[PDB]
Protein backbone atom coordinates (compact mmCIF):
# COMPACT_ATOMS: atom_id res chain seq x y z
CA UNK A 1 0.00 0.00 0.00
CA UNK A 2 3.03 2.21 0.12
CA UNK A 3 3.14 3.60 -3.47
CA UNK A 4 2.38 7.32 -3.72
CA UNK A 5 5.60 9.83 -2.81
CA UNK A 6 5.19 12.64 -0.28
CA UNK A 7 1.65 12.24 0.38
CA UNK A 8 1.46 13.92 3.83
CA UNK A 9 1.13 12.39 6.56
CA UNK A 10 -2.64 14.50 7.30
CA UNK A 11 -3.55 13.10 3.97
CA UNK A 12 -2.40 9.27 4.31
CA UNK A 13 -4.18 9.37 8.17
CA UNK A 14 -7.14 11.70 6.84
CA UNK A 15 -7.45 9.17 3.54
CA UNK A 16 -7.63 5.91 6.47
CA UNK A 17 -9.91 7.20 8.65
CA UNK A 18 -12.40 8.45 5.71
CA UNK A 19 -12.43 5.54 4.56
CA UNK A 20 -13.16 3.83 7.99
CA UNK A 21 -16.10 6.61 8.45
CA UNK A 22 -17.88 5.89 4.93
CA UNK A 23 -17.35 2.38 5.46
CA UNK A 24 -19.42 2.43 8.98
CA UNK A 25 -21.36 4.84 7.91
CA UNK A 26 -22.72 2.51 5.02
CA UNK A 27 -23.13 -0.67 7.14
CA UNK A 28 -24.01 0.39 10.57
CA UNK A 29 -25.54 4.04 9.83
CA UNK A 30 -27.04 3.73 6.12
CA UNK A 31 -25.04 6.36 4.49
CA UNK A 32 -26.84 9.15 7.00
CA UNK A 33 -24.70 11.40 9.06
CA UNK A 34 -27.78 12.43 10.95
CA UNK A 35 -27.59 8.84 12.76
CA UNK A 36 -24.35 9.56 14.20
CA UNK A 37 -24.57 10.25 17.99
CA UNK A 38 -23.72 13.80 18.91
CA UNK A 39 -21.45 14.62 21.94
CA UNK A 40 -19.87 18.07 23.22
CA UNK A 41 -16.25 16.69 22.94
CA UNK A 42 -15.01 13.20 21.83
CA UNK A 43 -12.50 11.93 24.41
CA UNK A 44 -11.13 11.30 28.07
CA UNK A 45 -13.32 8.19 28.71
CA UNK A 46 -11.36 5.48 30.60
CA UNK A 47 -11.68 2.27 28.82
CA UNK A 48 -12.95 0.49 32.50
CA UNK A 49 -31.76 16.43 37.67
CA UNK A 50 -32.24 19.96 37.07
CA UNK A 51 -31.78 20.65 41.10
CA UNK A 52 -29.42 18.41 42.80
CA UNK A 53 -27.44 18.69 46.40
CA UNK A 54 -24.46 16.26 47.40
CA UNK A 55 -22.75 16.14 50.70
CA UNK A 56 -19.69 14.69 51.13
CA UNK A 57 -18.57 12.57 53.84
CA UNK A 58 -15.21 10.27 55.15
CA UNK A 59 -16.74 7.18 53.62
CA UNK A 60 -17.48 8.39 50.06
CA UNK A 61 -15.99 6.99 46.98
CA UNK A 62 -13.97 9.56 45.48
CA UNK A 63 -14.78 8.45 41.47
CA UNK A 64 -18.82 7.87 42.53
CA UNK A 65 -19.28 11.30 43.97
CA UNK A 66 -16.78 13.16 40.65
CA UNK A 67 -19.16 11.38 38.25
CA UNK A 68 -22.16 12.36 40.23
CA UNK A 69 -21.03 16.14 40.36
CA UNK A 70 -19.87 16.08 36.26
CA UNK A 71 -23.78 14.26 35.38
CA UNK A 72 -24.54 12.27 32.31
CA UNK A 73 -24.60 14.40 29.73
CA UNK A 74 -21.27 15.42 27.92
CA UNK A 75 -20.62 19.08 28.54
CA UNK A 76 -17.98 21.34 30.33
CA UNK A 77 -19.17 19.66 33.27
CA UNK A 78 -18.45 16.97 32.74
CA UNK A 79 -15.06 17.80 31.40
CA UNK A 80 -14.46 19.57 34.55
CA UNK A 81 -15.41 17.08 37.15
CA UNK A 82 -13.54 13.75 35.16
CA UNK A 83 -10.72 15.48 32.99
CA UNK A 84 -8.16 14.07 34.82
CA UNK A 85 -5.43 17.24 33.49
CA UNK A 86 -6.20 20.55 32.52
CA UNK A 87 -3.86 22.48 29.51
CA UNK A 88 -1.31 25.15 30.50
CA UNK A 89 0.42 27.85 28.15
CA UNK A 90 1.48 24.33 26.13
CA UNK A 91 2.07 21.98 29.34
CA UNK A 92 -0.55 19.25 31.74
CA UNK A 93 -1.21 19.91 34.80
CA UNK A 94 -3.64 17.98 37.43
CA UNK A 95 -7.19 19.00 37.31
CA UNK A 96 -7.23 22.11 39.96
CA UNK A 97 -11.30 21.23 39.72
CA UNK A 98 -11.22 17.86 41.17
CA UNK A 99 -8.42 18.68 43.45
CA UNK A 100 -10.79 21.77 44.92
CA UNK A 101 -13.95 19.70 44.59
CA UNK A 102 -11.93 16.22 46.67
CA UNK A 103 -14.85 14.96 48.74
CA UNK A 104 -14.67 15.92 52.23
CA UNK A 105 -16.56 16.15 55.55
CA UNK A 106 -18.80 19.32 55.53
CA UNK A 107 -18.84 19.83 51.96
CA UNK A 108 -21.92 20.47 50.20
CA UNK A 109 -22.15 21.11 46.22
CA UNK A 110 -25.36 22.56 45.14
CA UNK A 111 -25.79 22.35 41.43
CA UNK A 112 -28.38 23.83 39.94
CA UNK A 113 -29.67 24.45 36.00
CA UNK A 114 -28.01 21.10 35.45
CA UNK A 115 -30.11 20.33 32.43
CA UNK A 116 -29.11 23.46 30.13
CA UNK A 117 -25.31 23.64 30.44
CA UNK A 118 -24.85 27.20 29.28
CA UNK A 119 -26.65 28.32 32.46
CA UNK A 120 -25.42 25.56 34.94
CA UNK A 121 -23.86 26.77 38.16
CA UNK A 122 -22.02 24.60 40.92
CA UNK A 123 -21.89 26.34 44.26
CA UNK A 124 -19.54 24.45 46.76
CA UNK A 125 -19.81 25.23 50.35
CA UNK A 126 -18.29 24.18 53.13
CA UNK A 127 -17.97 25.22 57.13
CA UNK A 128 -16.50 28.34 57.65
CA UNK A 129 -16.64 29.92 61.07
CA UNK A 130 -18.95 27.21 61.93
CA UNK B 1 -16.56 -0.17 16.10
CA UNK B 2 -19.70 2.86 15.78
CA UNK B 3 -19.25 6.75 14.51
CA UNK B 4 -19.22 9.63 16.55
CA UNK B 5 -19.55 13.50 16.17
CA UNK B 6 -18.28 16.39 18.62
CA UNK B 7 -19.89 19.84 18.26
CA UNK B 8 -17.84 21.05 15.54
CA UNK B 9 -18.90 17.88 13.79
CA UNK B 10 -15.90 16.18 13.45
CA UNK B 11 -16.94 12.18 12.55
CA UNK B 12 -14.48 10.22 14.64
CA UNK B 13 -14.29 6.21 14.87
CA UNK B 14 -15.56 5.39 17.90
CA UNK B 15 -13.87 3.20 19.47
CA UNK B 16 -12.36 1.69 22.57
CA UNK B 17 -8.80 3.75 22.39
CA UNK B 18 -10.20 6.83 20.34
CA UNK B 19 -12.81 6.79 23.22
CA UNK B 20 -9.92 7.14 26.02
CA UNK B 21 -7.33 9.29 23.49
CA UNK B 22 -9.84 11.70 22.10
CA UNK B 23 -8.50 11.08 18.77
CA UNK B 24 -9.12 8.71 16.20
CA UNK B 25 -7.95 5.28 16.22
CA UNK B 26 -4.88 5.76 14.39
CA UNK B 27 -1.43 5.85 15.50
CA UNK B 28 2.41 6.52 13.84
CA UNK B 29 4.01 3.88 16.21
CA UNK B 30 7.63 4.94 17.35
CA UNK B 31 10.01 4.71 14.74
CA UNK B 32 13.95 4.45 14.15
CA UNK B 33 14.82 6.90 12.69
CA UNK B 34 11.28 7.90 10.98
CA UNK B 35 9.57 9.16 14.41
CA UNK B 36 13.36 10.12 15.67
CA UNK B 37 12.57 13.62 13.77
CA UNK B 38 10.84 15.93 16.22
CA UNK B 39 9.25 17.54 12.81
CA UNK B 40 7.44 14.07 11.65
CA UNK B 41 6.03 13.62 15.49
CA UNK B 42 4.84 17.44 14.96
CA UNK B 43 3.40 17.30 11.64
CA UNK B 44 1.30 14.27 13.01
CA UNK B 45 0.41 15.26 16.19
CA UNK B 46 -1.11 18.64 14.30
CA UNK B 47 -2.72 16.07 11.70
CA UNK B 48 -4.69 14.98 14.67
CA UNK B 49 -3.58 11.11 14.91
CA UNK B 50 -1.25 9.31 18.08
CA UNK B 51 2.77 9.47 17.68
CA UNK B 52 5.56 7.98 19.49
CA UNK B 53 8.41 9.82 19.32
CA UNK B 54 11.32 7.38 19.33
CA UNK B 55 14.21 7.16 21.44
CA UNK B 56 16.29 4.89 19.40
CA UNK B 57 17.66 7.92 17.73
CA UNK B 58 18.84 9.91 20.76
CA UNK B 59 21.10 8.59 23.51
CA UNK B 60 20.70 10.96 26.36
CA UNK B 61 18.67 12.37 28.19
CA UNK B 62 19.47 15.88 26.86
CA UNK B 63 18.78 14.86 23.01
CA UNK B 64 15.80 13.45 24.23
CA UNK B 65 15.10 17.00 26.15
CA UNK B 66 15.77 18.91 23.32
CA UNK B 67 13.94 17.01 20.65
CA UNK B 68 10.54 17.25 23.07
CA UNK B 69 10.92 20.88 23.55
CA UNK B 70 11.16 21.00 19.51
CA UNK B 71 8.18 18.78 19.70
CA UNK B 72 6.44 20.96 22.08
CA UNK B 73 7.02 24.14 20.60
CA UNK B 74 6.12 22.60 17.04
CA UNK B 75 2.42 21.15 18.13
CA UNK B 76 -0.12 23.71 18.97
CA UNK B 77 -1.71 24.61 22.38
CA UNK B 78 -3.18 21.27 24.09
CA UNK B 79 -1.68 19.03 21.63
CA UNK B 80 -0.02 15.71 22.63
CA UNK B 81 2.25 13.09 21.98
CA UNK B 82 3.74 9.76 23.13
CA UNK B 83 7.40 8.31 23.73
CA UNK B 84 8.48 5.02 22.41
CA UNK B 85 11.70 3.23 24.35
CA UNK B 86 13.42 0.31 23.77
CA UNK B 87 13.85 -2.78 26.15
CA UNK B 88 16.40 -4.73 25.09
CA UNK B 89 19.23 -1.78 25.84
CA UNK B 90 19.06 -1.07 29.67
CA UNK B 91 20.90 2.11 29.09
CA UNK B 92 18.39 3.60 27.13
CA UNK B 93 15.55 2.91 30.01
CA UNK B 94 18.07 3.99 32.40
CA UNK B 95 18.50 7.09 31.16
CA UNK B 96 14.59 7.37 29.69
CA UNK B 97 12.69 6.35 32.27
CA UNK B 98 14.14 9.35 34.97
CA UNK B 99 13.63 11.48 31.90
CA UNK B 100 10.24 10.67 31.42
CA UNK B 101 9.45 10.94 35.01
CA UNK B 102 10.81 14.05 35.25
CA UNK B 103 8.98 15.81 32.01
CA UNK B 104 5.64 14.55 33.47
CA UNK B 105 6.19 16.19 36.66
CA UNK B 106 7.24 19.48 35.18
CA UNK B 107 3.71 18.69 32.99
CA UNK B 108 4.92 18.18 29.76
CA UNK B 109 2.24 16.64 27.17
CA UNK B 110 3.69 12.99 27.04
CA UNK B 111 0.50 11.21 26.79
CA UNK B 112 2.14 7.60 26.82
CA UNK B 113 5.09 5.48 26.71
CA UNK B 114 5.53 2.45 24.46
CA UNK B 115 7.68 -0.14 25.43
CA UNK B 116 8.63 -2.22 22.31
CA UNK B 117 11.59 -5.31 21.34
CA UNK B 118 10.18 -6.69 24.89
CA UNK B 119 7.29 -6.71 27.61
CA UNK B 120 8.88 -5.10 31.11
CA UNK B 121 8.52 -7.73 33.89
CA UNK B 122 5.03 -6.86 36.35
CA UNK B 123 7.38 -5.18 39.12
CA UNK B 124 9.07 -2.75 35.86
CA UNK B 125 5.61 -2.10 34.74
CA UNK B 126 3.92 -1.30 38.21
CA UNK B 127 7.13 1.51 38.63
CA UNK B 128 6.31 2.38 35.01
CA UNK B 129 2.36 3.11 35.57
CA UNK B 130 3.03 4.32 39.10
CA UNK B 131 5.92 6.58 38.71
CA UNK B 132 5.35 8.14 35.57
CA UNK B 133 1.59 9.64 35.53
CA UNK B 134 1.07 8.49 32.08
CA UNK B 135 -2.28 8.61 30.16
CA UNK B 136 -1.87 5.34 29.32
CA UNK B 137 0.62 2.50 28.95
CA UNK B 138 1.89 1.01 25.34
CA UNK B 139 3.38 -2.50 25.54
CA UNK B 140 4.31 -4.45 22.12
CA UNK B 141 3.80 -8.15 22.73
CA UNK B 142 6.08 -10.41 20.30
Redesign the interface.
Same mark, same amino acid.
Request: overall charge negative; aromatic content about 14%; hydrophobic content about 40%.
Given at each position: FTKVIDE =?? +?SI @??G??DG??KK??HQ??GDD?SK? =?????????? =?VEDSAVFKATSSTDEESWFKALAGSEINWRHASFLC?FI??? +? @???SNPIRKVFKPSQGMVVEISNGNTSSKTVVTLSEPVQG | PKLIKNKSGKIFVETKFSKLIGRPPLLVPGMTPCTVSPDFVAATTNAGYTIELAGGGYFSAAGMTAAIDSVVSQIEKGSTFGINLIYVNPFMLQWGIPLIKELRSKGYPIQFLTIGAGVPSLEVASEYIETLGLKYLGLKPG
Open positions: =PI +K @MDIHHILLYYEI =PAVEYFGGES =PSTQD +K @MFV | -
